[PDB]
Structure 1
Amino acid sequence: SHTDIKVPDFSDYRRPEVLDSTKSSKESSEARKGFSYLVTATTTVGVAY
């Protein structure tokens, strides 16, 4: 009965790269982290200045 549990669909939340079930997340693993960590680094630069 715990096998009746399925994770709901996040398609209206996911980023564009990771919406394809038949495509690896490793492909966009590199870009997605850089986009978010770029925002952090810029913030520190502004605080630094």
Structure 2
Amino acid sequence: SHTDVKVPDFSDYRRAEVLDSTKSSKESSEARKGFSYLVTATTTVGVAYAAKNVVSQFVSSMSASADVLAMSKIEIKLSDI
């Protein structure tokens, strides 16, 4: 027929707060979304720390070299004159 089909058991795949069918959802959906979004935020803060690091390495590479910073600094006034 048309309602012969039932969705099978996902009990070997379901997360630990949504195993029970006697309890309802929207009581641990905040936790089960906030865990994966904490993983999303900490993955994105790893990507953001790498992006704030490597672009700063490249910007300090476009900045002045140690030979030029050693050459341009020597305004030694002395005490001879």
TM-score, normalised to structure 2, is: 0.58
Counterpart for residue 37 of structure 2: 37
Q: Quick check: which one's helix share is greater?
A: 1
Deviation at 1:22, TM superposition (A): 0.6
Cα RMSD of the aligned pairs, angstroms, is 0.7
Q: CA deviation at 1:25?
A: 1.3
Structure 1 runs of 4+ off > 4 angstroms?
A: none
- In the TM superposition, residue 40 of structure 1 has moved relative to its aligned partner by 0.7
Question: Gapped runs of 5+ residues in structure 1?
Answer: none
Structure showing greater radius of gyration is: 2
| 1:15-38: CA deviation from partner (whole Å, max 9, x where unpaired) | 011111111111111000000000
Q: Which runs of 5+ in 2 are unaligned?
A: 50-81
Deviation of residue 48 (structure 1)?
Answer: 1.0
CA distance in 1, matches of 2:28, 2:2: 32
Counterpart position of 1:24: 24
Give the drift of 1:4. Answer: 0.9
The corresponding residue for 1:14 is 14
Residue 3 of structure 1: how far off its partner (Å): 1.2
Kindly state the Cα deviation for residue 2 of structure 1 after the two structures are TM-superposed: 1.1
TM-aligned CA deviation for residue 44 of structure 1: 1.1
TM-score by length of 1: 0.91
